[PDB]
Amino acid sequence: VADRYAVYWNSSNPRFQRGDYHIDVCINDYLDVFCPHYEDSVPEDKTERYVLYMVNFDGYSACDHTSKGFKRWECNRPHSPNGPLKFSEKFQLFTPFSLGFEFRPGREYFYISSAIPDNGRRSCLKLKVFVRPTNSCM
Amino acid sequence: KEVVLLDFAAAGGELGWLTHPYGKGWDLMQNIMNDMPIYMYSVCNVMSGDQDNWLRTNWVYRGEAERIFIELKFTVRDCNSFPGGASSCKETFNLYYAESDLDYGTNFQKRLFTKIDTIAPDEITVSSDFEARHVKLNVEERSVGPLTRKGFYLAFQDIGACVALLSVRVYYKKCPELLQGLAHFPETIAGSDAPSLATVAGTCVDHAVVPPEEPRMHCAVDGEWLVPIGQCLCQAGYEKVEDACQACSPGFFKFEASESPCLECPEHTLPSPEGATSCECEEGFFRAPQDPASMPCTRPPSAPHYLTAVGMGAKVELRWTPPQDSGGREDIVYSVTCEQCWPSGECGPCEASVRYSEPPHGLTRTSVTVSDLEPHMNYTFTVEARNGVSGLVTSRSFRTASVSIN
Ligand SMILES: *[C@@H]1O[C@H](CO)[C@@H](O[C@@H]2O[C@H](CO)[C@@H](O[C@@H]3O[C@H](CO)[C@@H](O)[C@H](O)[C@H]3NC(C)=O)[C@H](O)[C@H]2NC(C)=O)[C@H](O)[C@H]1NC(C)=O
Ligand SMILES: *[C@@H]1O[C@H](CO)[C@@H](O)[C@H](O)[C@H]1NC(C)=O
Fold this sequence. Notes:
heterodimer; A: mainly beta; 4-stranded mixed beta sheet; 1 helix; B: mainly beta; Immunoglobulin-like; 7-stranded antiparallel beta sheet; 1% helix
């Protein structure tokens, strides 16, 4: 966990259920984001499904994905075959895809979720990500 | 038709090919697109100057293929749309290849490769195709031959550029299994040289064959067939149908080896069964030794319709009309005979002492003139209408008359 930072995105998480979950990655480090995985012994209603979004500060703040912000990942598979549905991100300065996204060293970035079943439209989950600067990664 | 050795595209991003050097070079991203999930193998060390970033496809088993067809899809980003912009970057990378007889696993060897082309973009993603989120995608293509060894590798070189491998897709080429004119042709594999014409012996479908020219086909490098030489014909009793060869209906036939269908049974002829060579003849009708079995059923000719004998002067002119039933033919030959019933009474055939103006038997005319005669005689005469089938008959057919001169 020196290049690759992992996080499992399910309501039953003690860092998220707080509200200030936040992390420190470096330029060229990854961010694996594992959805809520469910054994076939889960009755559909108790299966968490979300829709990940990459937004800014405001977007991070008022849990609002309508104004501005990307839609980056999607946990519609609570029943994925080989372990949990993975959604990865690399914090590299520069990206050769219109698709992809770029990451500045010593800015911070923000991610937020809204359940696919839609459940209680007011609060929600959220990660903050600070980028250690050019030379504070060691 | 094409046969595929590889499609990183549709591998739902689970292939993961060896990178080099040890993960500091090429990298794999996921990403949304058209709402569906897609993965790419990208690099972007424009800055780090001295490069050499390889990315090496697994191990493709050769198979039958001898010239393989590589087809990469990819976006390349522009070098002026970089803000820092350290101008050691580019938009050209390198395609390679390795023949091996044994997956070297995750052993890797640069020198071991030879290079195909330096692929480059037909569309640079520039600082604007970003703001909009515009996807400047490249389809470029190449291939190489011919491939001798068990199995081969691709692999890519990056000298510092902002590339991003969307699709690798490898496939080769065979010419479709084919029915073309009563010969069957394999499905069979193209080949390496550029004017390489596959020569493929055809084989004749059920019921058909070669008259002398051979059935043959020509298979190109693009997996196409080309110079139809020859054919096969629906044989003795069968008629070509579609690309089949169906038998001759109820009451038809086909005698020889022909491009022609089934001629319906002629006349005087019994409603043949299924697929009859020559048509079956009716009781009371015939055919000759030099006859076609198309030339219907015939019978010997009825006797001249009309007989007379004009005793014109001293020489009797013979004059007779042609038969009322030809026997459906046009090949009748009149044969004529003679006698001497003298009154006296003793009857008895002529003497060659008499003279004519034409030979006795086989007459394509209806008249002659008998000079050299004996005044006073029930001079009996008889002409006969005979054709060609007039030998499958003892039962004669003739007509007769008599004359006496003075
Ligand atoms: C919701 O969140 C829970 C807490 O965040 C998850 O609990 C985690 O499950 C992980 C995997 O199921 C565990 O990580 C594993 O650790 C073991 C031993 O260290 C390793 O063998 C595994 O490699 C590793 N992960 C993998 C990929 O197998 C965590 O230990 C555990 N974390 C905690 C603190 O509870 C739940 O799994 C998750 N539930 C749902 C519904 O998604
Ligand atoms: C010969 O001529 C007679 C007439 O005298 C005719 O009736 C007869 O047909 C002829 N002979 C025979 C064979 O009857």
